[PDB]
């Protein structure tokens, strides 16, 4: 897919910069009792008809990449997002997007389960709800019985740009 | 799957199980970007297997009817905002065919009822467990031509929900 860049290497090009973020939180619940949920991971169904992570374009009124990311999260989720900040400490990888001079920045934030729920809960009151944002979904991590149902089936769905691959890496690296 | 009449499908042996699901929808005067008219908000959901489907579940013997069994599953899967209405036999659509025959419904609500339904749908009993969240079908197609609804239909669905969506979009002039 799109070439993997360094931050500064990509930051060098004077271009459209777009940041998205995976909010996760640890999950002691079990499906049916049997199945481990492990973590609760927040994606969203976009206006595209594709699955993906929240956030969006970085503009000229953004003091830093983070400012725009944290801005585009509040737009898409409402004021549950104002309980945290995704801090570049969270920055994971960059990819050259299919748009005219479009780099894509991927973040991953560890929230607590108690913060994460209130995001879902405040999502109908969001500014872009039923507009850019159609609906928040969780990611299934368990994959069982069928040997195909669960996560694998989930990843057969459509994903925006590089979200599938961003999602896979986060599961690998942050050990599963 | 393969179509059948309702009575035909009610005339069946003890080894058969029945399952009910309902397409909820409401008129929407809003527009995407203040330009693309939206039309209706049509709720679908992310299942435990990552297959896109409609609210609903098995009828089972303990519910008095198919409608009851739908409405109960609907309050479990969607939360207590589904108690604001009740999806009757006059909201039934079709019956399709392991040994199961699946019934599909379409219920037209207010915009305010359907919006109130999304807010409470995280407090639902099956949220996190059975259901992993709610979504709206985009009905528009974007100027690129691929985007919008067509790209939403590229997703992997459960049983015949796709057929049932495409059916429900044309059949009451949502297309
Ligand atoms: N992991 C990933 N990996 C990779 N790329 C990823 C990834 N995740 C997401 N992306 C996506 O991230 C980009 C933007 O997506 P978003 O996440 O939604 O960012 P966002 O929330 O800040 O805003 C979205 C934009 O809003 C729209 O704007 C309207 C409107 O303002 C109006 C005015 O447009 P302007 O040209 O004046 O706006 P500017 O773009 O110039 O600022 O027309 C736009 N529009 C409508 N249809 C089209 C079209 N077919 N082609 C181009 N533009 C279109 C679109 O241009 C954009 O999709 C690409 O779509 C790319 O696919
Ligand atoms: N449009 C549609 N058109 C048509 N069919 C449709 C449509 N939409 C949904 N369906 C499906 O609605 C039926 C099930 O009801 P649901 O719609 O999911 O609503 P519901 O809330 O009652 O949930 C049914 C679930 O199924 C039950 O448990 C599972 C699981 O634990 C499992 C436990 O043992 P297994 O080893 O068999 O698990 P699997 O190997 O089967 O995955 O038994 C149930 N189950 C799991 N997978 C399947 C399958 N492919 N076919 C039939 N039953 C299945 C209940 O505990 C759950 O509630 C059929 O699975 C059917 O495929
Ligand atoms: Cl604004
Ligand atoms: Mg946005
Ligand atoms: Mg977006
Ligand atoms: Mg059930
Ligand atoms: Mg259920
Ligand atoms: Na924006
Ligand atoms: Na409209």
Residue numbers in the entry:
A (entry chain A): 3 to 16, 19 to 180
B (entry chain B): 4 to 100, 104 to 181
What are the paper's exact sentences on this?
Here we report the crystal structures of HsNudT16 in complex with ADPr and dimeric ADPr (di-ADPr). A 1″,2′-glycosidic linkage is observed between the first and second ADPr such that the latter subunit protrudes away from the substrate binding pocket. The second molecule (attached through C1) of ADPr does not make significant contacts to the Nudix fold beyond the mouth of HsNudT16. HsNudT16-di-ADPr structure suggests that the 2′-OH terminus of a PAR molecule is bound by the Nudix motif while the 1″-terminus, which is conjugated to proteins, is distal to the active site. Having said that, PARylated proteins would have even easier access to the HsNudT16 catalytic center with less steric hindrance than MARylated proteins where the latter would be closer to residues, such as Phe36′ and Phe61, at the mouth. In addition, the orientation of the PAR suggests a potential exonuclease activity from the 2′-OH terminus in concordance with the purported snoRNA decapping activity of HsNudT1660. However, since there is sufficient space to accommodate an additional ADPr linked to the 2′-OH terminus, we cannot exclude the possibility of endonuclease activity.
A similar cleavage reaction was observed in vitro with other enzymes from diverse organisms, including a snake venom phosphodiesterase (SVP), mammalian ectonucleotide pyrophosphatase/phosphodiesterase 1 (ENPP1), Escherichia coli RppH (EcRppH), and Homo sapiens NudT16 (HsNudT16). In addition, although NudT16 was initially characterized as a nucleolar U8 snoRNA decapping enzyme, it is involved in mRNA decapping and expresses across mouse tissues. Given the versatility in the recognition of substrates with diphosphate bonds, we and others have used some of these Nudix enzymes in vitro for processing ADP-ribosylation to a unique mass tag for site identification by tandem mass spectrometry (MS/MS). In this study, we sought to understand how HsNudT16 binds and hydrolyzes different forms of ADPr using X-ray crystallography.
